[PDB]
Amino acid sequence: PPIHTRRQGFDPADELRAAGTLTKISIETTWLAAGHAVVRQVLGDHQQFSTRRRGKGIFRPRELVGNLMDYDPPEHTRLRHLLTPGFTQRRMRRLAPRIEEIVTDRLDAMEQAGPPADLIELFADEVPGAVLCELIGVPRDDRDMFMKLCHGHLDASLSQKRRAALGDKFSRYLLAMIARERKDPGDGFIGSIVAEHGDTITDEELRGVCVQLMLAGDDNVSGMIGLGVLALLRHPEQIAALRGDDQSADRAVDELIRYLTVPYAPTPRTAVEDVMVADQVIKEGETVLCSLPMANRDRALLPDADRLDVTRTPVPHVAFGHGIHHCLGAALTRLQLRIAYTALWRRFPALQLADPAQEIMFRTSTPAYGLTSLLVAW
């Protein structure tokens, strides 16, 4: 496994810690950037670093259309500006009752199944996908078929005939939804965007964007819920931060994102020209991989970065990236994580590992760290 994907419990592995701020490693020829200063520079200075997979404009592959991470300015600048109406603060406030209802249903399922039960299978793996459907406006009756089509086109256990057949039905439903939404836009993700930029944004872009959001906000949030619940059980005096006001909980959630930093790396950058980084020159065309988990344990970011402390004041961590590509789902993640953790200990105040000796089953195969299962009792 690539060294930048190795964890040791909640922490980056020792051999990852042993790599410098900036070193060349092999996957080929690629820089590993691990300091906080150095990572902020690579992620923000889009004047010297491109994210495009090495092909702009009409010549961009269909699989990357609508994926802002493959866009540089000014192409990036246009599409992100055009999606901004779907992420207003009014949007988040209306989604909150819907996230509360989704969280309650999953707690009910856990409470119906009786203890002990798998938190990952019944709670952490179900919420983020239902939340995303609310975001983009999938009908409430189609949530189950939609998630089937969404996972179906990527299930590596399926053949090329099966996955491609499911991928074609996926692109039909969205194009159906967008054209249906375009002809009569109410309030929602598609509706808010086309009512304001209907002439500037194509259905191919709007389809591409909806697909990419499903992929952007699922593995990351489910990972956060599992690791977060286990993080609090291992630091039991910090559960109290989830039993007060919203400021106390929001502060805890943002510390949990930084401490756990579920994604191993952001999109690879390519040097557009010779650029100085940490007293070393990166030649044009060379690749730079960023370790977000090492960046968020950098003791320049904060002393005792390796300790979890949900009462501490937020700091400029890079778990959501930095600069123009900063996670478009950040506010949504903060909201739904606050609703989930808070509701969980409110329904099950006496939550605990079902058996403290059980093995911890870490998710290591996906782009986001997490757990594959977690039996608990209450």
Ligand code: HEM
């Ligand atoms: C635990 C939750 C999440 C984490 C830790 C996370 C992490 C990140 C990171 C590190 C980036 C920067 C990519 C780069 O610079 O290469 C990013 C970008 C992005 N995220 Fe997230 N993400 C999360 C949830 C979500 C959700 C829920 C959504 C959508 C609902 C989302 C949508 C996006 C999009 C579209 C981008 C591309 C932004 C751009 O280039 O303009 N993310 N995310």
Ligand SMILES: [K+]
């Ligand atoms: K995913």
Ligand SMILES: [K+]
């Ligand atoms: K993983």
